[PDB]
Enzyme design. Structure first.
Site, PDB file in Angstrom:
ATOM      1  N   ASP A 133       0.835  -1.194   0.000  1.00  0.00           N
ATOM      2  CA  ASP A 133       0.000   0.000   0.000  1.00  0.00           C
ATOM      3  C   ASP A 133       0.876   1.253   0.000  1.00  0.00           C
ATOM      4  N   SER A 138      11.818  -0.085   2.686  1.00  0.00           N
ATOM      5  CA  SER A 138      12.453  -0.372   1.409  1.00  0.00           C
ATOM      6  C   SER A 138      12.251  -1.837   1.044  1.00  0.00           C
ATOM      7  N   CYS A 193      24.073  -3.517 -18.222  1.00  0.00           N
ATOM      8  CA  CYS A 193      22.984  -2.594 -17.921  1.00  0.00           C
ATOM      9  C   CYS A 193      23.474  -1.164 -17.726  1.00  0.00           C
ATOM     10  N   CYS A 213      16.895   8.979 -14.669  1.00  0.00           N
ATOM     11  CA  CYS A 213      16.219   7.746 -15.048  1.00  0.00           C
ATOM     12  C   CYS A 213      14.927   8.025 -15.812  1.00  0.00           C
ATOM     13  N   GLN A 219       7.010   9.924 -15.393  1.00  0.00           N
ATOM     14  CA  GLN A 219       5.980  10.084 -14.373  1.00  0.00           C
ATOM     15  C   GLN A 219       5.888  11.516 -13.850  1.00  0.00           C
ATOM     16  N   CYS A 242      17.284  -1.711 -18.537  1.00  0.00           N
ATOM     17  CA  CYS A 242      18.311  -2.324 -17.693  1.00  0.00           C
ATOM     18  C   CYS A 242      17.878  -3.688 -17.151  1.00  0.00           C
ATOM     19  N   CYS A 246      19.694  -7.589 -19.490  1.00  0.00           N
ATOM     20  CA  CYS A 246      20.341  -8.415 -18.477  1.00  0.00           C
ATOM     21  C   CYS A 246      20.327  -9.895 -18.850  1.00  0.00           C
TER      22      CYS A 246
HETATM   23  C1  B12 Z   1      11.391   5.529  -5.571  1.00  0.00           C
HETATM   24  C2  B12 Z   1      11.121   4.319  -6.418  1.00  0.00           C
HETATM   25  C3  B12 Z   1      11.515   4.322  -7.728  1.00  0.00           C
HETATM   26  C4  B12 Z   1      12.348   5.469  -8.337  1.00  0.00           C
HETATM   27  C5  B12 Z   1      13.840   5.195  -8.067  1.00  0.00           C
HETATM   28  C6  B12 Z   1      14.148   3.760  -7.640  1.00  0.00           C
HETATM   29  C7  B12 Z   1      15.577   3.521  -7.209  1.00  0.00           C
HETATM   30  N1  B12 Z   1      16.297   2.737  -7.994  1.00  0.00           N
HETATM   31  O1  B12 Z   1      16.021   4.024  -6.174  1.00  0.00           O
HETATM   32  C8  B12 Z   1      11.961   5.339  -9.836  1.00  0.00           C
HETATM   33  C9  B12 Z   1      10.695   6.176 -10.074  1.00  0.00           C
HETATM   34  C10 B12 Z   1      13.057   5.787 -10.814  1.00  0.00           C
HETATM   35  C11 B12 Z   1      11.715   3.845  -9.888  1.00  0.00           C
HETATM   36  C12 B12 Z   1      12.026   3.042 -10.984  1.00  0.00           C
HETATM   37  C13 B12 Z   1      11.803   1.665 -11.021  1.00  0.00           C
HETATM   38  N2  B12 Z   1      11.260   0.877 -10.071  1.00  0.00           N
HETATM   39 CO1  B12 Z   1      10.678   1.575  -8.383  1.00  0.00          CO
HETATM   40  N3  B12 Z   1      10.301   2.019  -6.583  1.00  0.00           N
HETATM   41  C14 B12 Z   1      10.533   3.050  -5.801  1.00  0.00           C
HETATM   42  C15 B12 Z   1      10.181   2.818  -4.332  1.00  0.00           C
HETATM   43  C16 B12 Z   1       8.890   3.567  -3.951  1.00  0.00           C
HETATM   44  C17 B12 Z   1      11.268   3.128  -3.272  1.00  0.00           C
HETATM   45  C18 B12 Z   1      12.653   2.681  -3.734  1.00  0.00           C
HETATM   46  C19 B12 Z   1      13.689   3.432  -2.933  1.00  0.00           C
HETATM   47  O2  B12 Z   1      13.433   3.880  -1.818  1.00  0.00           O
HETATM   48  N4  B12 Z   1      14.882   3.567  -3.505  1.00  0.00           N
HETATM   49  C20 B12 Z   1      16.012   4.218  -2.865  1.00  0.00           C
HETATM   50  C21 B12 Z   1      17.303   3.335  -2.932  1.00  0.00           C
HETATM   51  C22 B12 Z   1      18.448   4.099  -2.320  1.00  0.00           C
HETATM   52  O3  B12 Z   1      17.096   2.184  -2.141  1.00  0.00           O
HETATM   53  P1  B12 Z   1      16.386   0.810  -2.575  1.00  0.00           P
HETATM   54  O4  B12 Z   1      16.735   0.593  -4.050  1.00  0.00           O
HETATM   55  O5  B12 Z   1      14.939   0.693  -2.277  1.00  0.00           O
HETATM   56  O6  B12 Z   1      17.332  -0.246  -1.821  1.00  0.00           O
HETATM   57  C23 B12 Z   1      18.600  -0.713  -2.253  1.00  0.00           C
HETATM   58  C24 B12 Z   1      19.729   0.313  -2.187  1.00  0.00           C
HETATM   59  O7  B12 Z   1      19.569   1.153  -1.050  1.00  0.00           O
HETATM   60  C25 B12 Z   1      20.954  -0.600  -2.045  1.00  0.00           C
HETATM   61  N5  B12 Z   1      21.995  -0.070  -1.169  1.00  0.00           N
HETATM   62  C26 B12 Z   1      22.063  -0.162   0.194  1.00  0.00           C
HETATM   63  N6  B12 Z   1      23.283  -0.101   0.667  1.00  0.00           N
HETATM   64  C27 B12 Z   1      24.084   0.040  -0.463  1.00  0.00           C
HETATM   65  C28 B12 Z   1      25.464   0.158  -0.580  1.00  0.00           C
HETATM   66  C29 B12 Z   1      26.052   0.290  -1.836  1.00  0.00           C
HETATM   67  C30 B12 Z   1      27.549   0.425  -1.938  1.00  0.00           C
HETATM   68  C31 B12 Z   1      25.238   0.300  -2.998  1.00  0.00           C
HETATM   69  C32 B12 Z   1      25.845   0.435  -4.369  1.00  0.00           C
HETATM   70  C33 B12 Z   1      23.857   0.183  -2.873  1.00  0.00           C
HETATM   71  C34 B12 Z   1      23.298   0.058  -1.613  1.00  0.00           C
HETATM   72  O8  B12 Z   1      20.509  -1.835  -1.513  1.00  0.00           O
HETATM   73  C35 B12 Z   1      19.083  -1.801  -1.303  1.00  0.00           C
HETATM   74  C36 B12 Z   1      18.508  -3.176  -1.553  1.00  0.00           C
HETATM   75  O9  B12 Z   1      18.658  -3.562  -2.913  1.00  0.00           O
HETATM   76  C37 B12 Z   1      10.016   1.285  -4.329  1.00  0.00           C
HETATM   77  C38 B12 Z   1       8.972   0.688  -3.366  1.00  0.00           C
HETATM   78  C39 B12 Z   1       9.470   0.578  -1.942  1.00  0.00           C
HETATM   79  N7  B12 Z   1       8.631   0.963  -0.995  1.00  0.00           N
HETATM   80  O10 B12 Z   1      10.602   0.149  -1.701  1.00  0.00           O
HETATM   81  C40 B12 Z   1       9.757   0.886  -5.791  1.00  0.00           C
HETATM   82  C41 B12 Z   1      10.445  -0.414  -6.322  1.00  0.00           C
HETATM   83  C42 B12 Z   1      11.869  -0.398  -5.796  1.00  0.00           C
HETATM   84  N8  B12 Z   1      10.489  -0.182  -7.757  1.00  0.00           N
HETATM   85  C43 B12 Z   1      10.196  -1.235  -8.446  1.00  0.00           C
HETATM   86  C44 B12 Z   1      10.143  -1.251  -9.922  1.00  0.00           C
HETATM   87  C45 B12 Z   1       9.374  -2.423 -10.460  1.00  0.00           C
HETATM   88  C46 B12 Z   1      10.807  -0.294 -10.659  1.00  0.00           C
HETATM   89  C47 B12 Z   1      11.086  -0.242 -12.159  1.00  0.00           C
HETATM   90  C48 B12 Z   1      11.659  -1.557 -12.724  1.00  0.00           C
HETATM   91  C49 B12 Z   1       9.797   0.199 -12.896  1.00  0.00           C
HETATM   92  C50 B12 Z   1      10.040   0.307 -14.404  1.00  0.00           C
HETATM   93  N9  B12 Z   1       9.698  -0.738 -15.139  1.00  0.00           N
HETATM   94  O11 B12 Z   1      10.523   1.337 -14.884  1.00  0.00           O
HETATM   95  C51 B12 Z   1      12.177   0.863 -12.243  1.00  0.00           C
HETATM   96  C52 B12 Z   1      13.608   0.319 -12.090  1.00  0.00           C
HETATM   97  C53 B12 Z   1      14.703   1.368 -12.270  1.00  0.00           C
HETATM   98  C54 B12 Z   1      16.043   0.904 -11.745  1.00  0.00           C
HETATM   99  N10 B12 Z   1      16.922   0.517 -12.656  1.00  0.00           N
HETATM  100  O12 B12 Z   1      16.285   0.896 -10.534  1.00  0.00           O
HETATM  101  C55 B12 Z   1       9.907  -2.435  -7.580  1.00  0.00           C
HETATM  102  C56 B12 Z   1      11.118  -3.380  -7.585  1.00  0.00           C
HETATM  103  C57 B12 Z   1      10.746  -4.849  -7.752  1.00  0.00           C
HETATM  104  C58 B12 Z   1      11.970  -5.724  -7.613  1.00  0.00           C
HETATM  105  N11 B12 Z   1      11.836  -6.980  -8.002  1.00  0.00           N
HETATM  106  O13 B12 Z   1      13.028  -5.268  -7.172  1.00  0.00           O
HETATM  107  C59 B12 Z   1       9.680  -1.795  -6.164  1.00  0.00           C
HETATM  108  C60 B12 Z   1      10.214  -2.665  -5.015  1.00  0.00           C
HETATM  109  C61 B12 Z   1       8.152  -1.663  -6.038  1.00  0.00           C
HETATM  110  C62 B12 Z   1       7.450  -2.945  -5.546  1.00  0.00           C
HETATM  111  N12 B12 Z   1       6.762  -2.849  -4.421  1.00  0.00           N
HETATM  112  O14 B12 Z   1       7.542  -3.995  -6.190  1.00  0.00           O
HETATM  113  N13 B12 Z   1      11.197   3.387  -8.731  1.00  0.00           N
HETATM  114  S1  SF4 Z   2      17.717   1.648 -18.275  1.00  0.00           S
HETATM  115 FE1  SF4 Z   2      17.077   1.440 -16.100  1.00  0.00          FE
HETATM  116  S2  SF4 Z   2      18.203   3.109 -15.028  1.00  0.00           S
HETATM  117 FE2  SF4 Z   2      18.303   3.596 -17.252  1.00  0.00          FE
HETATM  118  S3  SF4 Z   2      16.514   4.968 -17.607  1.00  0.00           S
HETATM  119 FE3  SF4 Z   2      15.794   2.851 -18.055  1.00  0.00          FE
HETATM  120  S4  SF4 Z   2      14.908   2.135 -16.080  1.00  0.00           S
HETATM  121 FE4  SF4 Z   2      16.165   3.972 -15.584  1.00  0.00          FE
HETATM  122  S1  SF4 Z   3      24.079  -9.375 -14.640  1.00  0.00           S
HETATM  123 FE1  SF4 Z   3      22.350  -8.019 -15.250  1.00  0.00          FE
HETATM  124  S2  SF4 Z   3      22.104  -6.600 -13.482  1.00  0.00           S
HETATM  125 FE2  SF4 Z   3      24.146  -7.583 -13.231  1.00  0.00          FE
HETATM  126  S3  SF4 Z   3      25.587  -6.134 -14.245  1.00  0.00           S
HETATM  127 FE3  SF4 Z   3      25.000  -7.664 -15.832  1.00  0.00          FE
HETATM  128  S4  SF4 Z   3      23.226  -6.708 -16.897  1.00  0.00           S
HETATM  129 FE4  SF4 Z   3      23.499  -5.553 -14.952  1.00  0.00          FE
END
Ligand code: B12
Ligand code: SF4
Ligand code: SF4
Length: 374
Positions: A133, A138, A193, A213, A219, A242, A246
């Site tokens: 919801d 995260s 990717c 992105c 959006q 991306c 993959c």
């Molecule tokens: C904001 C948001 C977005 C934003 C940015 C997402 C992002 N990459 O940060 C936008 C609008 C761009 C977006 C895009 C997409 N999203 Co979106 N989004 C969200 C939302 C609401 C929060 C994500 C968030 O807080 N991100 C902030 C980052 C910082 O954190 P996080 O990715 O959630 O967590 C990871 C990082 O923090 C990382 N991290 C932690 N420590 C460290 C340390 C290091 C060194 C590194 C490198 C990383 C790292 O590890 C965490 C676990 O993987 C979530 C729902 C939710 N409540 O979680 C959905 C969610 C993440 N999104 C989702 C989807 C489906 C997508 C898209 C594929 C949609 C699309 N087809 O375009 C794209 C993917 C883009 C991409 N390549 O990442 C799904 C992911 C499903 C899955 N199997 O993972 C989620 C989980 C929604 C859901 N409930 O299913 N989204």
């Molecule tokens: S390839 Fe992935 S990171 Fe790049 S714009 Fe598309 S969804 Fe965003």
């Molecule tokens: S395996 Fe997929 S997600 Fe990992 S670096 Fe290669 S293309 Fe990106």
């Protein structure tokens, strides 16, 4: 006892649809807390994330005396069956795979309600709170710490069997469940990717610049920056680049959920009819997908951009009409810019009049762009 409830939980969840289930503690996500701060410090967040970081990292804050979080995952189809073709005369826009069929928010909400209904049926004073919801935790972090999948270089949670094509959800409980183990990262040295990203939003492995992105840009409700207008392509909502590129997603197309099956006429709809769709018709045709949670305005804007990308000269009359008649400055300006981008100098006169009548300076500024392009 606790182990038994866990086994009955796993067994039941798989019978109702859940493709993968995991377990983790209700402890705070320390690595996430630092990442959220770091990402914001660089301004890499989207603004769609939850503002309060404290609620995002502390499971025990959302649910008192919580001791576990149950994470689930549902695999969605990646290939569309009998998808129409974008012909010269009839151009089509494309919705991302994460918006095919019924909204995954509603599907995952229905599954967790049953899982909560299951735990309540045991009548053991069990307290739960579904984190679907909206929207504090995260989902990726929870999934990784529950062994659902590893955090790939494209920030995606990638499962061994279903790839990255999975929806994520979780449910905080007060049950002392035994947590699972985070799986091994299988990305290795691959960087496909990162290079395939049209805007270079993936500045680093596992690090995203959401402002660049395309998925986020589609959006937005304002004017799209000119540097992205030619890179959006035909995308109406979201971006799967991306994921499709993959190797771990190669040969991954699960049709395990009928309600997730895309309707090819709205999943990949004709661009021009979207330019003249009412609020009523939009809610009827698109109101049941995830890509409609912002309204028709951002989608219509991207349709105009996609038409200018295709240089559909047959759309020029409708684009012209929106420039003068549409009550939205974003639509008027985008249409005008598209008219110039298409490159038909005959419509230069009609850009001139609109330039006089337009009072919104942003829209007035966009008209001047279309004039220049001719
Ligand atoms: C904001 C948001 C977005 C934003 C940015 C997402 C992002 N990459 O940060 C936008 C609008 C761009 C977006 C895009 C997409 N999203 Co979106 N989004 C969200 C939302 C609401 C929060 C994500 C968030 O807080 N991100 C902030 C980052 C910082 O954190 P996080 O990715 O959630 O967590 C990871 C990082 O923090 C990382 N991290 C932690 N420590 C460290 C340390 C290091 C060194 C590194 C490198 C990383 C790292 O590890 C965490 C676990 O993987 C979530 C729902 C939710 N409540 O979680 C959905 C969610 C993440 N999104 C989702 C989807 C489906 C997508 C898209 C594929 C949609 C699309 N087809 O375009 C794209 C993917 C883009 C991409 N390549 O990442 C799904 C992911 C499903 C899955 N199997 O993972 C989620 C989980 C929604 C859901 N409930 O299913 N989204
Ligand atoms: S390839 Fe992935 S990171 Fe790049 S714009 Fe598309 S969804 Fe965003
Ligand atoms: S395996 Fe997929 S997600 Fe990992 S670096 Fe290669 S293309 Fe990106």
């Amino acid at each position: 006892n606790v182990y038994q409830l866990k086994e009955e939980l796993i067994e039941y969840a798989k019978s109702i649809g859940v493709d993968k289930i995991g377990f983790t503690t209700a402890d705070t996500f320390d690595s996430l807390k630092d990442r959220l701060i770091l990402q914001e410090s660089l301004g890499y967040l989207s603004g769609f994330e939850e503002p309060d970081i404290e609620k995002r990292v502390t499971p025990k804050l959302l649910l008192p005396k919580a001791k576990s979080i149950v994470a689930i995952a549902l695999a969605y189809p990646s290939r569309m069956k009998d998808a129409p073709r974008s012909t010269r005369t009839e151009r089509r826009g494309i919705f991302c795979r994460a918006s095919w069929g019924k909204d995954y928010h509603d599907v995952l909400r229905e599954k967790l309600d049953l899982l909560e209904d299951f735990l309540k049926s045991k009548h053991e004073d069990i307290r739960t709170k579904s984190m679907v919801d909206t929207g504090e935790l995260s989902d990726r972090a929870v999934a990784e710490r529950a062994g659902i999948g590893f955090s790939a270089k494209n920030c995606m949670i990638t499962t061994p069997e279903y790839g990255s094509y999975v929806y994520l959800a979780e449910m905080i409980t007060n049950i002392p469940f035994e947590p699972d183990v985070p799986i091994e990262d299988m990305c290795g040295s691959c960087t496909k990717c990162l290079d395939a990203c049209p805007t270079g939003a993936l500045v680093n492995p596992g690090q995203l610049n959401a402002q660049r992105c395309i998925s986020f840009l589609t959006q937005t409700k304002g004017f799209l920056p000119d540097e992205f207008r030619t890179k959006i392509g035909n995308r109406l909502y979201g971006c799967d680049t991306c994921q499709t590129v993959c190797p771990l997603n190669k040969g991954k197309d699960f049709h395990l959920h009928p309600e997730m099956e895309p309707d090819p006429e709205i999943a990949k709809p004709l661009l021009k009819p979207l330019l003249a769709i009412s609020n009523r018709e939009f809610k009827e045709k698109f109101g049941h997908v995830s890509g409609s949670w912002r309204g028709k305005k951002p989608i219509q804007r991207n349709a105009i951009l996609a038409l200018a990308h295709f240089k559909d000269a047959s759309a020029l009359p409708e684009l012209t009409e929106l420039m003068h008649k549409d009550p939205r400055p974003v639509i008027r300006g985008t249409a005008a810019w598209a008219i110039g981008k298409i490159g038909d100098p005959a419509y230069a006169e009609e850009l001139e009049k609109a330039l006089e009548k337009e009072k919104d300076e942003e829209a007035k500024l966009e008209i001047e762009k279309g004039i220049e392009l001719l």
